[PDB]
């Protein structure tokens, strides 16, 4: 099928530059131009440019000046790059592939990838396991998490048991504390009968930092 | 309404 | 450029009813326009395209309409699969842009929540920090009270909440909201008290532990 994947999220410091590679499949960069679009809290959905099948790019006009799009057919890779980049460039970026090879009805998308522009630094996330108990067990039903603090930038990934485990799961979005830095917890209600036999494990991924931790989370 | 960068969602 | 208009910013509806979407521009652009979708956590889907053009693997359910500056894109039956933002796109004029969005959110009957506490984990105190994990979860609606009593004292201001998007597949809610102390202070106190108040309780819920 048709996929564009993107490279991972991470941080730029003011006045520094974005790189963001789009690995493409299913289709051909001879056959299709590739276009990118942001988005950002202030002012959203925002088109960026495109590099078109034949090479040419067209950026749009605020961004002529601090944009290129380049593009390896053989490997399947776009590359985008701006630069100059300050507070509120701290956006979505997504790669994106129309229907038809000329128009903009973007049918395809990237996974986006969050960039963060700050002079801060990126840290890793500790991960505290939220254990089972009484204090969290009702009608046969328990509950149980990961508490996965202190962390820049945004995002991490958490999954259950390497995705075995969705249902019953809920990834609270991130808070920013006074320290600047995010924390937030994942928990998850399971059979309390479960707690003896099954093993439940929180696969924590902080890519701007390259962390990965499992935590393993037992009654206590 | 304002975009949120973590659950990619608008927040009102 | 072009500017989009969508209106209104919040749209709250209850399944199997019916809802329009409006996407106003500040000039005539003909049928040049296309709608997306985004769930949470998600990148956007192309739901319509051309005002009302079809596109496959795309539910029956949601059509568009308009020509000129008025549009519209509506879901006959709205299901709960159906939470996400809604985002017009023209393409009539260079460069295309996009409107500012619509969000949909669900009705559903009041259901109480479920409250856990957790006391914080050895592992996190060899930090020396502590933090108080209060877990509401799978209520609707999404308006709570959670107050911190530490020793009978009232806390404020040291601890933060976070609630996540609505669920697609039940339309609840669920809340986290996290004291956070000192180490020191954690240990000069014995009672930590967390206490729900929700619109499906017919009384406030307290869940509390002894420190050791
Ligand atoms: C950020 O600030 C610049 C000026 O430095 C302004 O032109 C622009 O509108 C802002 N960008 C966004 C996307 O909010």
């Known amino acids: 099928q048709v996929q564009l994947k993107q490279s991972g999220p991470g941080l730029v410091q003011p006045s520094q530059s974005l790189s963001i590679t789009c690995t493409v499949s299913?289709?051909?960069?001879?056959?299709?131009?590739v276009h990118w679009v942001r988005q950002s809290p202030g002012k959203g959905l925002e088109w960026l440019g495109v590099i078109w099948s034949g090479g040419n790019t067209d950026y749009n006009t605020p961004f002529t000046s601090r944009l290129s799009i380049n593009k390896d057919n053989s490997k399947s890779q776009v590359f985008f790059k701006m630069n100059s980049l300050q507070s509120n460039d701290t956006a979505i970026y997504y790669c994106?592939?129309?229907?038809?090879?000329?128009?903009?009805?973007?049918?395809?998308w990237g996974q986006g990838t969050l960039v963060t522009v700050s002079a801060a630094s990126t840290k890793g996330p500790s991960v505290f396991p939220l254990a089972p108990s009484s204090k969290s067990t009702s009608g046969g039903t328990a509950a149980l998490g990961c508490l996965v603090k202190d962390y820049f930038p945004e995002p991490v990934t958490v999954s259950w048991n390497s995705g075995a485990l969705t249902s019953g799961v809920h990834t609270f979005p991130a808070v920013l504390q006074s320290s600047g830095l995010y924390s937030l917890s994942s928990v998850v209600t399971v059979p309390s009968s479960s707690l003896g036999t099954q093993t439940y494990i929180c696969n924590v991924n902080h890519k701007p930092s390259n962390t990965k931790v499992d935590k393993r989370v037992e009654p206590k | 309404x304002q975009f949120d960068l973590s659950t990619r969602r608008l927040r009102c | 450029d072009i500017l989009l208009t969508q209106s209104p910013v919040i749209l709250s509806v209850s399944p199997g009813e019916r809802v329009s979407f409006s996407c106003r521009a500040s000039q005539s652009i003909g049928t040049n326009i296309h709608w997306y979708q985004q769930r949470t956590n998600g990148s956007p889907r192309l739901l319509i395209k051309?005002?009302?053009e079809s596109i496959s693997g795309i539910p029956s359910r949601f059509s568009g309409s308009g020509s000129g500056t008025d549009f519209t894109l509506s879901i006959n039956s709205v299901e709960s699969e159906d939470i996400a933002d809604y985002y017009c796109q023209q393409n009539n004029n260079w460069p295309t842009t996009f409107g500012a969005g619509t969000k949909l959110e669900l009705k559903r009957t009041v259901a109480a929540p479920s409250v856990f506490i957790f006391p914080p984990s050895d592992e996190q105190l060899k930090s020396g920090t502590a933090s108080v994990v209060c877990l509401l979860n799978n209520f609707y609606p999404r308006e709570a009270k959670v107050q911190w009593k530490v020793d009978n004292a009232l806390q404020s201001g040291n601890s933060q909440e976070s609630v996540t998007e609505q669920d697609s597949k039940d339309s609840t809610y669920s809340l986290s909201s996290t004291l956070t102390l000192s180490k020191a202070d954690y240990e000069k106190h014995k009672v930590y008290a967390c206490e729900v108040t929700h619109q499906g309780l017919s009384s406030p819920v307290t869940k509390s532990f002894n420190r050791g």
């Open positions: 994106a592939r129309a229907l038809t090879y000329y128009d903009y009805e973007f049918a395809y």
């Open positions: 051309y005002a009302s």
């Open positions: 299913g289709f051909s960069l001879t056959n299709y131009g």
